[model samples]
Target: HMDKTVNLSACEVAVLDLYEQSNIRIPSDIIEDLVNQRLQSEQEVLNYIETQRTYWKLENQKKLYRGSLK
Candidate 1:
């Protein structure tokens, strides 16, 4: 769900940044495992990515963020 809220740590953010730059397009299951051992599911990871991207978009809109490859 778009309204779901998730908190990501600095290490996770780094992994996400790498994925974005490399266009890894990793499956949600893999991400879920890396994000949380107890939450190994595609949907969860998808939601996590969705929330993260939303956060990134908002931060970028404020001109306080930039992509690694951009």
Candidate 2:
């Protein structure tokens, strides 16, 4: 089998996860928001709560969009 994951710092992994979510499942649209509002460095991304907010907001937006399908 091929190596699916690589060595990454916690912050690096966080962004990757966020990016992955944004790619599909309709979430993490804030990946850009974070860059615009938050710092674009891997240092700040080390905090869990900070990124969690983006993940939370991403879910909120995606779920709301589903309701608009009516």
lDDT of each: 0.53, 0.48
lDDT of 2 by residue, 1-70 (tens): 1222123434545666675677623234434344334433565643543556657777667744455665
Candidate 1 lDDT over 3-66, as tens digits, reads: 2223344545555666779785654544554455323344555466666666656765886345
Q: What TM-score does model 1 achieve against the real structure?
A: 0.37
For model 1, what is the error of residue 2's alpha carbon versus the real structure, in angstroms, after optimal superposition? 28
Candidate 2 worst ten-residue window by lDDT: 1-10
Clashes of each: 0, 0
TM-score of each: 0.37, 0.29
